[PDB]
Amino acid sequence: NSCAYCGIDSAKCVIKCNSCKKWFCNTKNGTSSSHIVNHLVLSHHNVVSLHPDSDLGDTVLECYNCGRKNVFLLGFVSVVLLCRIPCAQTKWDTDQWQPLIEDRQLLSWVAEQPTEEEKLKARLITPSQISKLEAKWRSNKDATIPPLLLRYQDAYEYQRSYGPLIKLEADYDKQLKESQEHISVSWSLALNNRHLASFTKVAIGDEMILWYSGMQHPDWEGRGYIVRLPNDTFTLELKPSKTPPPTHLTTGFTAEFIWKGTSYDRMQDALKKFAIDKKSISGYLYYKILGHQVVDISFDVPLPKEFSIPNFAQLNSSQSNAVSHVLQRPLSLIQGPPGTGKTVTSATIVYHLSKIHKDRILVCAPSNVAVDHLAAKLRDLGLKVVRLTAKSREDVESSVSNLALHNLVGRGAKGELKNLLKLKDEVGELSASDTKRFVKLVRKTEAEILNKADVVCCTCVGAGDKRLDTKFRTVLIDESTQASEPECLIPIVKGAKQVILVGDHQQLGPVILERKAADAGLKQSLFERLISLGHVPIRLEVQYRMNPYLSEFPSNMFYEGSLQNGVTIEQRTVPNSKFPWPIRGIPMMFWANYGREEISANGTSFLNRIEAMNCERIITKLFRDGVKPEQIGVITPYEGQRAYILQYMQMNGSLDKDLYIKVEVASVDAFQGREKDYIILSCVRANEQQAIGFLRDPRRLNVGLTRAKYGLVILGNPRSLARNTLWNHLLIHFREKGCLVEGTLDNLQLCTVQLV
RNA sequence: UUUUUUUU
Ligand SMILES: Nc1ncnc2c1ncn2[C@@H]1O[C@H](COP(=O)(O)OP(=O)(O)O)[C@@H](O)[C@H]1O
Ligand code: ALF
Ligand SMILES: [Mg+2]
Ligand SMILES: [Zn+2]
Ligand SMILES: [Zn+2]
Ligand SMILES: [Zn+2]
């Protein structure tokens, strides 16, 4: 009954985690969070109960209303425990709701701090000891490489360099994002004659393992795939096994989502292909990637009279010369600050390569939304685009769903396949014989569609999909600077002859969880290495996206003031606006909010209720000013804030709820390459320690400031952001303009925080 | 760090 970390034993201090049955105290000791919070965050556990002798007795904390038991959701209204959402928005006194977890530790009346005397039971413990102890419990419940080179002799040395780095990341991801009760199962038989288990971050097809250990039956394990998801029941279709399923058992089952390292697996396969598949890549590109010296090549290619496409953007001379130069090179690097038309230029290039060679082109980006964006532009130019989406996201809403391979299969299909599709939709099921027949026909149809496409669009990793068992001679990777080198390698090692890489090293880099891998240089993109090796990139420096006032800070802070404006204040102003900008003629403002951050539902992210609230007020205000939902974008660094802002407006939106769902809400990272007329930036971070996490990255702020065309509102807490040098420069820049404000939207005042 | 990627 003592804290499994340090040994504190006070009945008023310890908390039981219901999952593993271990006890933890509520003290911050060698840990940024209290020990109980630290355990929940790392282990992904949610449910806790107080000590019997505590001031509240043996009680499992749960919501009075719906009865959920995730502490990261729980708060109290005065007392009554209620979920953050939806229970705390529904109308005792909702407006005074406060979370049980405050400043990364439970409230004192839920779990006290130890007296000095009680603290004596606490053994000296380092952060290291605590960290390794959690890692150890992953398996057992117990107690307390050649460096990246400038030049590679050959592909095998290349592989032995990046390979172990990939594995490090993979192992750390698995240990970090793996998942984890008392499940009641109802059994049935699927038409295909497989066993179905129904019970109780998920998608149909996901592999799971179901197992039982207890006093009703010998140990049993079973693997299967998700075939139905909560509208309230989940349904897992089990694989055929030698040992029959215990269909007579109902309770005491455990289920576990199986971690897939698919992304890392495909990076390794690309590395191996590069070393081993002789048709995987051209000679020029091969040695280029190796870091060798190669004589520059030109393609014998007929140029068009005009590079710009009618009824679309008219390229400036730099963009035009760029497309002219690229059409004849095996390798091209397009570089430039935000909004310089890198993507429009790329779309033009793809368009022209298509007409000249009439040959399939592979188009990629690290993120899904960047892929969609580019696919849309290409479709607008009248190209036959096929968007290959991950199996995981086939049910995800998209702006280019009509281009998705799976939707193309359904549409414009006939005969036996048409029958099997209608049958599967109306019945919801297929027999064994019809399933094998269905799979054969779909593959045949998929191949035929992919083969006749002018362009195939997918994420870099998605390029490693098995459906793409064919050669792609020309590859364009947009936002390539967001990808690690092996990730970029995936689409390039498919018989590539001509490659175009677009990027900006001042915008977001790849996410490397493992610090040793990042230290070893896994953060360096292919785009960057090729440049540091002497490859001269085409540079674009005239920006066409945003009002000149919005480009000022980013230009001076990240691009040595080299970023020019191609559009004017008059081109980026709204003659009839009545939106309460602080200063006439300047469409930006930093609205200081003095809320505090909260830990999100999955225990690993953040949200900010006050910032979310004022976000709804900004949007509603814009609505009143006649600004349309499609013209507004909300970006935030944290997935926790993204989820909350979305749900919150669906409950508290002043106007028609349907208006608010059409307002895009995304993460900063996810939104790179995209733009909106109006942007709301929610910074989220606000705590006593003035810690701001990965907001320290200049490249994340850069992206956050460069999404808007007409207007930008920044919501944030200066008290904590100001400790950071970069953010301090931003606040000061806004203060100098008269745009740093506080108070209520309808009566904004100059911010009073003291900036030095 | 908490963000991108991904499932017969
Ligand atoms: N030559 C041009 N004339 C008019 N608008 C342009 C021109 N070049 C780019 N734009 C536009 O300015 C914005 C940014 O283009 P984009 O390709 O997304 O920039 P980047 O990819 O470098 O971030 C878009 O709204 C786009 O259509
Ligand atoms: F560089 Al961008 F949208 F691709 F600002
Ligand atoms: Mg772009
Ligand atoms: Zn402790
Ligand atoms: Zn636990
Ligand atoms: Zn609830």
- Number of distinct helices: 22
Q: What profile does the largest beta sheet have?
A: 7 strands, parallel
CATH class of the largest domain: Alpha Beta
Task: Count the beta strands.
Answer: 30
Ends apart, CA distance between termini: 49 Å
Integer tally of domains: 5
Strand order of the largest sheet: 15-16-14-17-18-13-19
- Provide the CATH superfamily of the largest domain: P-loop containing nucleotide triphosphate hydrolases
Share of helix, binned = 25-40%
CATH topology of the largest domain: Rossmann fold
Question: Could you say which structural class the secondary elements and strand pairing correspond to?
Answer: alpha/beta
* Cα radius of gyration in angstroms: 28 Å
Could you explain the architecture of this structure?
The PDB classes it as hydrolase/rna. Keywords: hydrolase-RNA complex, NMD, RNA degradation, allosteric regulation. It forms a dimeric assembly. Upf1-RNA complex. The chain is of the alpha/beta class. It has 5 domains: 1-143, no CATH class; 180-258, Elongation Factor Tu (Ef-tu), domain 3 (Beta Barrel), CATH 2.40.30.230; 278-399 and 453-544, 3-Layer(aba) Sandwich (Rossmann fold); 400-452, Helix Hairpins (Helix non-globular); 545-756, Rossmann fold. It has 22 helices and 30 strands. The strands form 7 sheets. The protein has a 7-stranded parallel sheet, with helices on both faces. A hairpin with a 6-residue loop joins strand 23 and strand 24 (606-607). Helix 3 runs antiparallel to helix 4 (262-276), helix 10 (416-427) crosses helix 11 (432-451) and helix 15 packs antiparallel against helix 20. It is globular, with a radius of gyration of 28 Å. Bound molecules: adenosine-5'-diphosphate, tetrafluoroaluminate ion, magnesium ion and zinc ion (3 copies). The site of one zinc ion has 8 residues, from strand 2. The structure holds one RNA strand of 8 nucleotides.
